[PDB]
Amino acid sequence: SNAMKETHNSQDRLAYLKQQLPADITRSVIDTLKEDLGGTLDPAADITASLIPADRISTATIITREAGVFCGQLWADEVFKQLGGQVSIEWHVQDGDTLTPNQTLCTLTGPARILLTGERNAMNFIQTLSGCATATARYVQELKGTQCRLLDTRKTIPGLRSALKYAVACGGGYNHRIGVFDAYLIKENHIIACGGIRQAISTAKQLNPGKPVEVETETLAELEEAISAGADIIMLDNFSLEMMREAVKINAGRAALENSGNITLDNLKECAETGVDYISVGALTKHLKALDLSMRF
Amino acid sequence: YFQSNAMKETHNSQDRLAYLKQQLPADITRSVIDTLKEDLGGTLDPAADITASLIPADRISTATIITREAGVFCGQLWADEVFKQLGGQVSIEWHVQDGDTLTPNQTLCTLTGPARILLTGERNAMNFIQTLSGCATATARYVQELKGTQCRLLDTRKTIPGLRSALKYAVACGGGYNHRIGVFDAYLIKENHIIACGGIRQAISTAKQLNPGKPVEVETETLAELEEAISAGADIIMLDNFSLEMMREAVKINAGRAALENSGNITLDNLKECAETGVDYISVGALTKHLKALDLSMRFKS
Ligand SMILES: [Mg+2]
């Protein structure tokens, strides 16, 4: 079925993402350390840490004061590798694990100056990615009892697209297109330009074979036309609950239906209960509620 | 020569405002390039946008970016850079300037150029404006709570990765003040450094020796530690989780000798009350660690 086919598209995207992550992790980490150190990757630039003896070895633990879902160990590991690799980390949690208040995330051991310099940077990644995974899981809870799945969007904090799409995955959400290069999102503008939905879809399939094709519809008539034109996925743009139920009944399980627009944590369940297959939520990646962490020596 | 705490703080702001201005153009370009490459799949070539390829190449369109809620605007330079990086064919007429107060449904800018380029750049430009404006907007909200007081709002090092300079700038646009940019421009002496040096005056004199002009801040958890820190020559004292009465006692003990900065579980609910104790500054991690993006919308006229 088309709904199950989208689950396959989501896994293909997560695969592309995992393949690109090492490079993206290195890039964000370097830029973050550079900003903190003042344009250099030399940890000796941390003036306060220099008040500690050069030879001191210390052990610290990072703890979450809040419940949620963990994400970010790969980024925290890279922070310490970029600082020289002298600090070793024992992780007590894995990406995607549920966290309870005051749970220990990891234990770090190495030169005290390095731990001091890397601590905030490592925590800034963890709190951000964990924050996104945590928000995602809260949204996913609203779908209980339905077969509906949550999708992310292109409304992401700049520089962290791949990290946030990964955190969404860690929180139980699914990935929609990574960018404008991996899937088509056909809208009214494109439909008019090509002279009809079937023509737009055909052009899309001829220009980039294999790329998923999604069509945005604003009315039931458009939906019906997109379904008739064989569309893979149909995005329902600002549909009322009534229109959603009607769309689901009209569709009869043919295409994958995805609702988009003005979705809040407070009305997500009601949207899912109409029978739509997916709900896209820009709030998962456009907003951020960082997980509160503490580092103790 | 004489240098008041007011003068020391102004000097500190001048230095980091100077640092931010010199480094900002490079950070804007760096962040914009990384953001476009993520969206286009490894390249800055707009031809990588497959759905935009369904629009005739020679169409020239006009669109506008609208805010759907009130707040403070920020990010003009980043949105400009998105279009410069995509080829510079898009012309942007701004109807607002960084720092401006916004009302719901207000038009931010009107863009004109090749349709395919507008389609590729729109989300990217919007992602920057919603982020920076969101930060500026939240900051302004905290600043509004400080009105009747002489208290100032400070940022921290708890910032979203890769956006430290952009967010320090957004906090400034929202009316907040910038604390140290990183670990290189000022000291933040804590208990472990004190124990390592054998006391507070020891830590402070060792700091001034190694990096003479760098401002020295000391974090304290008690009134006793506060008094040692001030009498030992700290420029700024960070009060860690002080109660309201401890803050009042702190202000009394200080007698204007050092600048006092509150760092605690301070939110919109208790910001005013904490400010009313007489502390000079309140540092708020929430301004840059969290984000409530400003809700934007792009409307194509043609
Ligand atoms: Mg409910």
mmCIF file of all heavy atoms in Angstrom, chain B residues 134-160:
data_model
loop_
_atom_site.group_PDB
_atom_site.id
_atom_site.type_symbol
_atom_site.label_atom_id
_atom_site.label_comp_id
_atom_site.label_asym_id
_atom_site.label_seq_id
_atom_site.Cartn_x
_atom_site.Cartn_y
_atom_site.Cartn_z
ATOM 1 N N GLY B 134 12.882 35.005 16.691
ATOM 2 C CA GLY B 134 12.318 34.295 17.837
ATOM 3 C C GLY B 134 13.123 34.565 19.093
ATOM 4 O O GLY B 134 12.564 34.756 20.180
ATOM 5 N N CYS B 135 14.440 34.573 18.925
ATOM 6 C CA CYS B 135 15.351 34.849 19.994
ATOM 7 C C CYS B 135 15.229 36.325 20.429
ATOM 8 O O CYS B 135 15.159 36.621 21.631
ATOM 9 C CB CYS B 135 16.772 34.514 19.563
ATOM 10 S SG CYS B 135 17.994 35.078 20.766
ATOM 11 N N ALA B 136 15.161 37.236 19.455
ATOM 12 C CA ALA B 136 15.019 38.656 19.744
ATOM 13 C C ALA B 136 13.690 38.910 20.456
ATOM 14 O O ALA B 136 13.629 39.682 21.408
ATOM 15 C CB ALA B 136 15.110 39.491 18.479
ATOM 16 N N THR B 137 12.629 38.248 19.986
ATOM 17 C CA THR B 137 11.303 38.381 20.580
ATOM 18 C C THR B 137 11.239 37.916 22.035
ATOM 19 O O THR B 137 10.678 38.606 22.864
ATOM 20 C CB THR B 137 10.277 37.603 19.758
ATOM 21 O OG1 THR B 137 10.224 38.171 18.452
ATOM 22 C CG2 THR B 137 8.905 37.686 20.380
ATOM 23 N N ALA B 138 11.789 36.736 22.328
ATOM 24 C CA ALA B 138 11.799 36.216 23.689
ATOM 25 C C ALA B 138 12.594 37.179 24.580
ATOM 26 O O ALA B 138 12.160 37.500 25.684
ATOM 27 C CB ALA B 138 12.389 34.796 23.765
ATOM 28 N N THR B 139 13.745 37.634 24.098
ATOM 29 C CA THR B 139 14.576 38.561 24.855
ATOM 30 C C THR B 139 13.771 39.805 25.237
ATOM 31 O O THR B 139 13.723 40.188 26.417
ATOM 32 C CB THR B 139 15.820 38.975 24.066
ATOM 33 O OG1 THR B 139 16.576 37.808 23.757
ATOM 34 C CG2 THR B 139 16.716 39.965 24.889
ATOM 35 N N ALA B 140 13.099 40.398 24.258
ATOM 36 C CA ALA B 140 12.314 41.586 24.496
ATOM 37 C C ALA B 140 11.277 41.362 25.591
ATOM 38 O O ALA B 140 10.997 42.295 26.339
ATOM 39 C CB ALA B 140 11.660 42.119 23.204
ATOM 40 N N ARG B 141 10.720 40.152 25.665
ATOM 41 C CA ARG B 141 9.725 39.796 26.672
ATOM 42 C C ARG B 141 10.310 39.888 28.094
ATOM 43 O O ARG B 141 9.658 40.403 29.009
ATOM 44 C CB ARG B 141 9.173 38.396 26.395
ATOM 45 C CG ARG B 141 8.123 37.979 27.399
ATOM 46 C CD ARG B 141 6.913 38.881 27.351
ATOM 47 N NE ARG B 141 6.085 38.670 28.528
ATOM 48 C CZ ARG B 141 6.148 39.418 29.622
ATOM 49 N NH1 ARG B 141 6.962 40.466 29.677
ATOM 50 N NH2 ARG B 141 5.376 39.128 30.653
ATOM 51 N N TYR B 142 11.524 39.371 28.272
ATOM 52 C CA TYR B 142 12.227 39.427 29.544
ATOM 53 C C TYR B 142 12.581 40.880 29.854
ATOM 54 O O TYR B 142 12.357 41.351 30.982
ATOM 55 C CB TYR B 142 13.488 38.573 29.544
ATOM 56 C CG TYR B 142 13.253 37.097 29.752
ATOM 57 C CD1 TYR B 142 12.696 36.304 28.758
ATOM 58 C CD2 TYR B 142 13.574 36.489 30.968
ATOM 59 C CE1 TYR B 142 12.474 34.959 28.958
ATOM 60 C CE2 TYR B 142 13.358 35.131 31.171
ATOM 61 C CZ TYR B 142 12.812 34.376 30.171
ATOM 62 O OH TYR B 142 12.585 33.043 30.369
ATOM 63 N N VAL B 143 13.110 41.597 28.860
ATOM 64 C CA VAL B 143 13.460 43.004 29.038
ATOM 65 C C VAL B 143 12.240 43.810 29.508
ATOM 66 O O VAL B 143 12.380 44.729 30.328
ATOM 67 C CB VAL B 143 14.042 43.663 27.768
ATOM 68 C CG1 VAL B 143 14.244 45.193 27.978
ATOM 69 C CG2 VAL B 143 15.330 43.011 27.359
ATOM 70 N N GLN B 144 11.051 43.500 28.988
ATOM 71 C CA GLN B 144 9.843 44.226 29.406
ATOM 72 C C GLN B 144 9.634 44.043 30.914
ATOM 73 O O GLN B 144 9.236 44.986 31.590
ATOM 74 C CB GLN B 144 8.587 43.844 28.593
ATOM 75 C CG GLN B 144 7.271 44.569 29.038
ATOM 76 C CD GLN B 144 7.282 46.097 28.856
ATOM 77 O OE1 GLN B 144 8.055 46.641 28.068
ATOM 78 N NE2 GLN B 144 6.396 46.785 29.573
ATOM 79 N N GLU B 145 9.923 42.863 31.453
ATOM 80 C CA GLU B 145 9.778 42.651 32.905
ATOM 81 C C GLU B 145 10.758 43.453 33.751
ATOM 82 O O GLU B 145 10.521 43.686 34.927
ATOM 83 C CB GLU B 145 9.870 41.161 33.288
ATOM 84 C CG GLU B 145 8.594 40.409 33.018
ATOM 85 C CD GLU B 145 7.426 40.943 33.842
ATOM 86 O OE1 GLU B 145 7.538 41.033 35.094
ATOM 87 O OE2 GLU B 145 6.380 41.264 33.229
ATOM 88 N N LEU B 146 11.861 43.888 33.167
ATOM 89 C CA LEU B 146 12.826 44.662 33.923
ATOM 90 C C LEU B 146 12.539 46.179 33.951
ATOM 91 O O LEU B 146 13.171 46.890 34.720
ATOM 92 C CB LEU B 146 14.235 44.401 33.394
ATOM 93 C CG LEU B 146 14.685 42.925 33.406
ATOM 94 C CD1 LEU B 146 16.109 42.782 32.863
ATOM 95 C CD2 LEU B 146 14.587 42.317 34.804
ATOM 96 N N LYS B 147 11.590 46.659 33.141
ATOM 97 C CA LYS B 147 11.269 48.112 33.055
ATOM 98 C C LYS B 147 11.531 49.093 34.198
ATOM 99 O O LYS B 147 12.284 50.065 34.037
ATOM 100 C CB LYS B 147 9.805 48.373 32.717
ATOM 101 C CG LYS B 147 9.348 48.193 31.294
ATOM 102 C CD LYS B 147 8.155 49.152 31.064
ATOM 103 C CE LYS B 147 7.052 49.053 32.146
ATOM 104 N NZ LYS B 147 6.055 50.155 31.997
ATOM 105 N N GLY B 148 10.848 48.917 35.319
ATOM 106 C CA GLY B 148 11.006 49.865 36.440
ATOM 107 C C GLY B 148 12.322 49.817 37.199
ATOM 108 O O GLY B 148 12.563 50.665 38.070
ATOM 109 N N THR B 149 13.172 48.842 36.861
ATOM 110 C CA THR B 149 14.462 48.623 37.528
ATOM 111 C C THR B 149 15.668 49.064 36.688
ATOM 112 O O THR B 149 15.529 49.406 35.527
ATOM 113 C CB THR B 149 14.630 47.118 37.822
ATOM 114 O OG1 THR B 149 14.910 46.404 36.608
ATOM 115 C CG2 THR B 149 13.371 46.548 38.465
ATOM 116 N N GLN B 150 16.839 49.100 37.313
ATOM 117 C CA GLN B 150 18.101 49.437 36.640
ATOM 118 C C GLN B 150 18.791 48.125 36.231
ATOM 119 O O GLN B 150 19.919 48.136 35.738
ATOM 120 C CB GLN B 150 19.036 50.251 37.561
ATOM 121 C CG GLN B 150 18.802 51.792 37.699
ATOM 122 C CD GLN B 150 17.361 52.211 37.895
ATOM 123 O OE1 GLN B 150 16.479 51.822 37.140
ATOM 124 N NE2 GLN B 150 17.132 53.079 38.852
ATOM 125 N N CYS B 151 18.092 47.005 36.393
ATOM 126 C CA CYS B 151 18.648 45.688 36.086
ATOM 127 C C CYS B 151 18.718 45.413 34.592
ATOM 128 O O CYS B 151 17.813 45.789 33.834
ATOM 129 C CB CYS B 151 17.796 44.621 36.762
ATOM 130 S SG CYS B 151 18.422 42.953 36.687
ATOM 131 N N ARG B 152 19.806 44.773 34.177
ATOM 132 C CA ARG B 152 20.035 44.415 32.781
ATOM 133 C C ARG B 152 20.039 42.917 32.599
ATOM 134 O O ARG B 152 20.380 42.179 33.516
ATOM 135 C CB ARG B 152 21.349 44.991 32.284
ATOM 136 C CG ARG B 152 21.319 46.487 32.195
ATOM 137 C CD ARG B 152 22.622 47.058 31.676
ATOM 138 N NE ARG B 152 22.486 48.500 31.531
ATOM 139 C CZ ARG B 152 23.399 49.305 31.002
ATOM 140 N NH1 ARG B 152 24.551 48.823 30.544
ATOM 141 N NH2 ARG B 152 23.144 50.605 30.925
ATOM 142 N N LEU B 153 19.631 42.489 31.408
ATOM 143 C CA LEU B 153 19.563 41.090 31.054
ATOM 144 C C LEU B 153 20.831 40.653 30.334
ATOM 145 O O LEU B 153 21.259 41.340 29.403
ATOM 146 C CB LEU B 153 18.357 40.947 30.127
ATOM 147 C CG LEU B 153 17.784 39.592 29.841
ATOM 148 C CD1 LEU B 153 17.285 38.977 31.135
ATOM 149 C CD2 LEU B 153 16.636 39.779 28.820
ATOM 150 N N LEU B 154 21.441 39.553 30.785
ATOM 151 C CA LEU B 154 22.642 39.016 30.155
ATOM 152 C C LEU B 154 22.368 37.639 29.560
ATOM 153 O O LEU B 154 21.468 36.926 30.022
ATOM 154 C CB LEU B 154 23.806 38.873 31.144
ATOM 155 C CG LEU B 154 24.417 40.145 31.711
ATOM 156 C CD1 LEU B 154 25.451 39.806 32.749
ATOM 157 C CD2 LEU B 154 25.054 41.025 30.617
ATOM 158 N N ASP B 155 23.104 37.322 28.498
ATOM 159 C CA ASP B 155 23.034 36.020 27.856
ATOM 160 C C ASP B 155 24.125 35.131 28.497
ATOM 161 O O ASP B 155 24.807 35.529 29.453
ATOM 162 C CB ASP B 155 23.130 36.100 26.306
ATOM 163 C CG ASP B 155 24.384 36.809 25.821
ATOM 164 O OD1 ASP B 155 25.371 36.874 26.577
ATOM 165 O OD2 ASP B 155 24.390 37.313 24.667
ATOM 166 N N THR B 156 24.286 33.921 27.972
ATOM 167 C CA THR B 156 25.216 32.948 28.532
ATOM 168 C C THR B 156 25.876 32.164 27.413
ATOM 169 O O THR B 156 25.717 32.497 26.247
ATOM 170 C CB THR B 156 24.406 31.895 29.327
ATOM 171 O OG1 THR B 156 23.561 31.146 28.414
ATOM 172 C CG2 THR B 156 23.540 32.539 30.402
ATOM 173 N N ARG B 157 26.607 31.122 27.780
ATOM 174 C CA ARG B 157 27.228 30.229 26.806
ATOM 175 C C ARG B 157 26.337 29.026 26.462
ATOM 176 O O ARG B 157 26.791 28.152 25.741
ATOM 177 C CB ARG B 157 28.616 29.762 27.264
ATOM 178 C CG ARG B 157 29.652 30.849 27.076
ATOM 179 C CD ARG B 157 30.994 30.484 27.638
ATOM 180 N NE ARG B 157 31.551 29.223 27.144
ATOM 181 C CZ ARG B 157 31.698 28.105 27.855
ATOM 182 N NH1 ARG B 157 31.372 28.060 29.137
ATOM 183 N NH2 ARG B 157 32.239 27.036 27.303
ATOM 184 N N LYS B 158 25.081 29.012 26.940
ATOM 185 C CA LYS B 158 24.124 27.936 26.654
ATOM 186 C C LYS B 158 23.393 28.367 25.392
ATOM 187 O O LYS B 158 22.315 29.022 25.431
ATOM 188 C CB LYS B 158 23.157 27.782 27.814
ATOM 189 C CG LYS B 158 23.825 27.363 29.096
ATOM 190 C CD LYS B 158 22.805 27.245 30.212
ATOM 191 C CE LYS B 158 23.471 26.782 31.525
ATOM 192 N NZ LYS B 158 22.447 26.470 32.548
ATOM 193 N N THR B 159 24.019 28.071 24.266
ATOM 194 C CA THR B 159 23.515 28.491 22.983
ATOM 195 C C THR B 159 23.395 27.299 22.034
ATOM 196 O O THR B 159 24.113 26.299 22.157
ATOM 197 C CB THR B 159 24.438 29.615 22.352
ATOM 198 O OG1 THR B 159 25.794 29.159 22.277
ATOM 199 C CG2 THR B 159 24.445 30.939 23.190
ATOM 200 N N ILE B 160 22.459 27.419 21.102
ATOM 201 C CA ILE B 160 22.235 26.401 20.098
ATOM 202 C C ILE B 160 23.526 26.324 19.279
ATOM 203 O O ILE B 160 24.004 27.355 18.808
ATOM 204 C CB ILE B 160 21.057 26.779 19.172
ATOM 205 C CG1 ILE B 160 19.754 26.770 19.969
ATOM 206 C CG2 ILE B 160 20.925 25.781 18.019
ATOM 207 C CD1 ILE B 160 18.622 27.431 19.236
#
